Ligand SMILES: *[C@](O)(C(N)=O)[C@H](C[C@@H]1CCNC1=O)NC(=O)[C@@H]1[C@@H]2[C@H](CN1C(=O)OCc1ccccc1)C2(C)C
């Protein structure tokens with residue numbers, strides 16, 4: 397038993413991390429087959445980053461301006477192109493540690509593991525959720541750019557995130573591995589605002605199921621509700637509307653506990669209206685929304 | 698910026714995980730050089746586990762009774778001995794992925810990463826603190842026994858924990874890699890109680906420094922205190938006494954923020970006496986005690 401925020405084992409991704417230096421800017425790249433992927437701002441000086449023209453900077457770079465290191469081995473760059481906000485560096489050696497992989501674009505509310513890296517070296521691993529406002533609540537210092545986010549399906553690494561920047565509020569913003577940002581952000585050092593964030597309702601229900609499985613059942617009431625009645629209450633608390641798709645996705649947890657989703661919704665409606673009255677749920681005084689239904693099924697069976 | 702519970706990258710430990718089967722009991726082992734380490738209760742039937750005689754069970758086992766698998770490769774066991782609550786299985790092949798490693802016994806209050814594994818296969822990675830009462834708050838299902846806890850010092854894996862059991866309260870208990878339990882526990886399925894737990898004061902101060910670094914500074918007051926006055930207040934709230942050793946260990950964080958440790962102690966004394974008055978610290982409505990000073994320096998510089 398027990399419930400913890402857990403990352404995927406990072407080994408298959410550790411074998412893909414390299415250091416990329418262009419001039420005096422160093423950050424991390426992801427080496428898959430004979431390609432290194434990194435944020436395109438590796439080509440900027442500190443001055444450029446205030447308002448960069450990436451096409452103009454990349455023109456004046458050669459293959460030779462890119463120093464790519466995997467441990468004490470230099471990889472020769474034999475080609476380079478920009479895809480949206482990501483540089484692709486063709487290199488002379490395919491990575492023999494390349495795992496089975498895919499590039500995916502995740503949806504808001506979904507989680508992934510972040511492998512935080514510095515100078516091509518893995519430092520730590522933790523779980524993030526893609527917020528409704530397309531930011532993530534991470535831990536990134538200078539040198540972490542190019543660190544990636546991923547899920548594992550048995551032996552297959554789904555890469556979904558590459559780290560680019562910190563917004564003025566201290567939340568984090570990045571691209572998919574095609575270099576398209578999540579959210580309405582650009583890779584320029586100028587002030588950018590995220591949308592108001594919202595609470596991921598389906599994940600709060602998942603976490604309430606985890607609490608029940610772990611014996612925290614004080615919030616369970618004898619009531620049911622309708623999806624419609626639930627959403628009319630929850631919208632006042634800035635909860636995302638719960639769809640039938642979400643209800644369907646919670647099916648496995650409803651089956652594991654014998655508690656109907658709309659029964660749980662009635663418990664959550666009461667928690668939102670009445671507060672936690674000085675009680676905790678899985679040790680927490682706040683409702684947690686960064687655990688998906690999958691995160692809960694995976695870990696709790 | 699930002700602060701998250703972060704595990705060490707698990708790659709160097711993933712390469713050491715194997716499946717160990719004896720009869721119809723399967724669990725995980727740790728393959729280092731030509732030795733596989735696993736919990737000794739791998740030799741028990743469900744009946745035996747209620748009150749086992751491990752020496753009597755191991756006598757009647759041969760090398761051949763132990764099925765050790767690393768992927769689709771069987772490892773032949775060519776010898777076996779018991780060290781306290783751990784089986785050592787000599788095998789015919791040294792593990793070529795053996796990292797630089799040490800066996801350490803951690804102290805209460807210290808953290809480690811747990812690589813949760815099932816059938817020799819890594820599933821997830823998360824941080825735990827060794828509680829003052831020698832339990833850990835983990836996430837372990839059936840099949841997780843033999844999963845290990847570790848710290849990494851650059852390229853060196855310090856193994857400090859192997860998972861054996863769940864106490865009736867749902868906290869977790871295990872041994873060092875010499876098979877000595879943390880705490881007054883035995884590997885038998887009979888009801889066992891941990892001591893009353895206590896709050897790791899030095900870690901709460903570390904986390905308050907992290908909150909300051911991340912701009913959460915509302916709890917900072919103009920006061921100082923003495924170690925003695927602090928400990929007389931904190932003992933009523935079931936906080937461990939703060940020693941000069943702890944004060945010394947917080948030195949780097951005091952230096953990073955320009956806030957004296959005894960200044961922070963005065964802020965914590967007020968939080969303990971007055972509560973959080975409906976405010977949060979790093980998003981949390983409770984004080985966090987499972988981040989060490991090292992966890993905070995590492996991540997926050
Ligand atoms: C990244 O380049 C790197 N080398 O690690 C860096 C990661 C930041 C640094 C602190 N936390 C992070 O997430 N990204 C940037 O510096 C990007 C880059 C300019 C500006 N910027 C950014 O994050 O702006 C805010 C900032 C905060 C702290 C330090 C530096 C900048 C662009 C957007 C191209």
Ligand SMILES: *[C@](O)(C(N)=O)[C@H](C[C@@H]1CCNC1=O)NC(=O)[C@@H]1[C@@H]2[C@H](CN1C(=O)OCc1ccccc1)C2(C)C
Pocket residue numbers: 397723724738746837838839840841842861862863864869883884885886
């Ligand atoms: C371990 O053997 C395994 N095969 O994973 C198992 C891990 C438990 C199972 C659920 N969470 C865990 O931490 N350990 C045990 O089953 C040990 C073993 C007997 C009894 N016991 C144990 O944890 O007792 C409580 C229990 C809870 C759930 C399921 C089974 C038992 C000893 C102590 C030798």
